Design a protein around this ligand. Structure first.
Ligand SMILES: [Cl-]
Ligand SMILES: [Cl-]
Ligand SMILES: [K+]
Ligand SMILES: [Mg+2]
Ligand SMILES: [Mg+2]
Ligand SMILES: [Mg+2]
Ligand SMILES: [Mg+2]
Ligand SMILES: [Mg+2]
Ligand SMILES: [Mg+2]
Ligand SMILES: [Mg+2]
Ligand SMILES: [Mg+2]
Ligand SMILES: [Mg+2]
Ligand SMILES: [Mg+2]
Ligand code: NA
Ligand code: NA
Ligand code: NA
Ligand code: NA
Ligand code: NA
Ligand code: NA
Ligand code: NA
Ligand code: NA
Ligand code: NA
Ligand code: NA
Ligand code: NA
Lengths: 46, 81, 119, 65, 194, 56
RNA sequence: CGCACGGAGGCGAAGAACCACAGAUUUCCGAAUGAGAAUCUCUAACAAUUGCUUCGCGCAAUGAGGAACCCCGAGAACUGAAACAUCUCAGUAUCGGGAGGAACAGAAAACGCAACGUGAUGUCGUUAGUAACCGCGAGUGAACGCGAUACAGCCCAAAC
RNA sequence: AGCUUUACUGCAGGCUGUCGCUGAG
């Protein structure tokens, strides 16, 4: 498929959102990303 | 108002282009053309830009690979910052 | 057009308008259909003017027959702004009436006669 | 902090613009050093550099430049 | 004495007789070739227009509108319906043609507001009404003690809410007594039974 | 050919996409109309009374 | 130095944090309005429809939203009648158009306790399940008046 | 509920008269 510049930005963001909760936030809050998406198991929009 | 140059894209591959091809890589604003990236660079570093190659990265930012003239030396330029 | 039963020769219309101009400066005139209509009804009308380029025509249709059953003479004018101008207005005028001319009583008289003859 | 409101207002239009371009450059070089993962940072200032620029720009607006 | 206007009025009491008759037989020929909404420089029925609020002034507009004659243009049911609700031919709309005309006009002039309207005849298949509209934003009107009322915000889209004269009549609000139990203060507050 | 699993294999066509107006993945890229907000069909936002219980 | 209690660092007696009012900034798409487009792109823009008009987009208007309420239009069926067609469900559900902080109504071609009487309009209580409707079946169903709330009365067309 | 028909009742549609558009001898 041929992705446009806008689609690319969105995919880009989705990839970034697909990261973990940094270790320090765990400490800073005396102690989970409910939006973890797998390329295979999940399905993005568009 | 948005600025053209965001910051230097420093990575191993960026170094090779710098040490071996007199090229500097930058993260630039995605609304910037090669020509604008060229000027901005010459102005911010006082050098002569020969060629500019761009790429819209999977990071949401636009990457520019800028080649300097033989007069200038990428390594030396990158060092002052 | 529907209320017009006879064509007034350009020259005649010229004379008529002339008399009108002197009528305002020497005697008295009424400008506007409402005022004209009241002259014919009150009898104080000597000669009434009606434009032929009026739209809607209902505005004037009643003049012809009204004037007849009052003996009051009437003449047609092609333009509407020409009659309005003659009466001395900056705007046009659908109809006007010479309420007692002035140093034109002679002319008006002949014009009234010239028209009767024009049937 | 290091730069105050008065000091900015006591400047001349041309002094603010010059000070602006200065700050921008410092900012750009702070970001560059961060791009290289350079640790000689001082996180408190890169944060300040942005507020300063905001202030200078804000005053230019107020002063009609 | 009679006003000149009274003659226009007296002629329109019988649009099928006299000069007016010949006038209509002629105009309608041009009318049938004009469009749905035609702005006109002067009211065809001066007495009526002025009587309804008209004024030779800036911001006062007039447009003739033609609407088809007859009952509702209805589509037969495409699902189950009891005999009572299976009609098509005899169903008529609850809004009269004059009201349809006032609305089509107002939509043509989005910035204007309907002041009133009056009939100017009909041929075998359509009716024409002349609608008087007002520019609520023109200072010539904002400063007119007789019309500035139509400038208030609550007069926006008045025709679409039936605040027009033909609207209120069609809403059965004419009578103030017997027969208006389900009409005043509004059809909707009365459960829509008017 | 079974209308089930075997007919699921040809489904590689893109229709509903992220909508420029409402952000929902309902913009039919072939019809150029959003099934959710009406973008491309209506200037007004798509909305119906049946989207909730009658007395609410 | 947000939720957010880490690490590093910073800001605050030049009175910060924080709160109130006011102002600055305010990307792209979006009524979306130069044109096109799944939020991007292409070469000056009130697109479109109107009013005024210096007849030039010069000055203006409209568009879309909003919890429901409000006004004007379109308008079912399940159901009840122990079947069912009128009737009923119901002018309900749902649909089209539109206003405002409230809408709508409103100063009698009224009422008609018939009077030597009342006196704009909403609304509340009542009048009353009365009058009236109805395969005179099932069902449907007011008003005048009265007691209250709140009160407010005016402008044109024409004559001259 | 789908279907049928000289089942009951209706509704589109076609045909036809009449009125309007519609006038002169
Ligand atoms: Cl309106
Ligand atoms: Cl009483
Ligand atoms: K039923
Ligand atoms: Mg990654
Ligand atoms: Mg490329
Ligand atoms: Mg199947
Ligand atoms: Mg656009
Ligand atoms: Mg039953
Ligand atoms: Mg109400
Ligand atoms: Mg029974
Ligand atoms: Mg009922
Ligand atoms: Mg009563
Ligand atoms: Mg059955
Ligand atoms: Na996937
Ligand atoms: Na970056
Ligand atoms: Na309008
Ligand atoms: Na009724
Ligand atoms: Na803001
Ligand atoms: Na505009
Ligand atoms: Na213009
Ligand atoms: Na039953
Ligand atoms: Na049954
Ligand atoms: Na019944
Ligand atoms: Na079946």
């Amino acid at each position: 498929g041929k992705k446009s510049k806008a689609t690319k930005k969105r995919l880009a963001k989705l990839d970034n959102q697909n990261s973990r909760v940094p270790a320090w936030v765990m400490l800073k809050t005396d102690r989970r990303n409910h939006k973890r998406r797998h390329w295979r198991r999940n399905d993005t929009d568009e | 108002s948005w600025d053209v140059i965001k910051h230097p894209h420093v990575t191993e591959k960026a170094m090779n282009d710098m040490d071996f091809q007199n090229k500097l890589q930058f993260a630039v604003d995605d609304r910037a053309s090669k020509g604008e990236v060229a000027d901005a660079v010459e102005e911010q570093y006082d050098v002569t830009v020969e060629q500019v190659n761009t790429q819209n990265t999977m990071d949401g930012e636009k990457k520019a690979v800028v080649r300097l003239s033989e007069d200038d030396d990428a390594q030396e330029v990158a060092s002052r910052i | 057009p529907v209320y017009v039963d006879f064509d007034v020769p350009a020259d005649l219309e010229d004379d008529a308008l002339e008399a009108l101009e002197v009528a305002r400066d020497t005697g008295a005139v009424k400008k506007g259909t409402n005022e004209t209509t009241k002259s014919i009804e009150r009898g104080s009308a000597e000669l009434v003017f009606v434009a032929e380029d009026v739209q809607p025509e209902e505005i004037v249709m009643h003049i012809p027959e009204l004037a007849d059953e009052k003996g009051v003479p009437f003449i047609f004018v092609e333009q509407q702004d020409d009659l309005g101008h003659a009466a001395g207005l900056e705007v046009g005028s659908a109809a006007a009436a010479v309420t007692d001319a002035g140093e034109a009583d002679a002319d008006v008289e002949d014009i009234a006669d010239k028209v009767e003859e024009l049937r | 902090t290091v730069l105050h409101v008065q000091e900015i207002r006591d400047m001349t239009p041309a002094e603010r613009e010059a000070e602006l371009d200065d700050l921008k450059t410092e900012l750009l070089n702070a970001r560059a050093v961060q791009a290289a993962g350079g640790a000689p940072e001082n996180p408190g200032r890169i944060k300040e550099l942005r507020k300063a620029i905001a202030r200078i720009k804000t005053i230019q607006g107020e002063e009609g430049d | 004495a009679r006003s000149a206007y009274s003659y226009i009025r007296d002629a329109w009491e019988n649009p099928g007789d006299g000069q007016l008759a010949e006038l209509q037989w002629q105009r309608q020929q041009e009318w049938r070739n004009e469009g749905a909404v035609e702005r006109i420089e002067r009211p065809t029925r001066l007495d009526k227009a002025r009587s309804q609020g008209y004024k030779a002034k800036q911001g006062v507009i007039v447009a003739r509108v033609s609407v088809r004659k007859g009952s509702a243009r209805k589509r037969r049911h495409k699902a189950g319906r009891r005999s009572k609700r299976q009609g098509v031919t005899r169903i008529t709309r609850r809004k009269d043609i004059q009201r349809v005309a006032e609305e089509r006009a107002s939509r043509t002039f989005p910035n204007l507001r309907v002041l009133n309207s009056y009939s100017v005849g009909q041929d075998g298949r359509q009716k024409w009404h002349e609608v008087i509209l007002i520019d609520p934003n023109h200072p010539a009107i904002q400063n007119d003690d007789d019309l500035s009322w139509i400038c208030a915000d609550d007069q926006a889209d008045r025709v679409f809410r039936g605040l027009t004269g033909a609207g209120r009549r069609n809403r059965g609000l004419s009578g103030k007594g017997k027969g208006s139990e389900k009409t005043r203060p509004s059809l909707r507050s009365n459960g829509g039974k008017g | 050919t079974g209308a089930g699993t075997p007919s699921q294999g040809k489904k590689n066509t893109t229709t509903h996409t992220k909508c420029r107006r409402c952000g929902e993945k309902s913009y039919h890229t072939k019809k150029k109309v959003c099934s959710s907000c009406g973008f491309g069909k209506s200037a007004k936002r798509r909305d119906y009374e049946w989207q909730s219980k009658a007395g609410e």
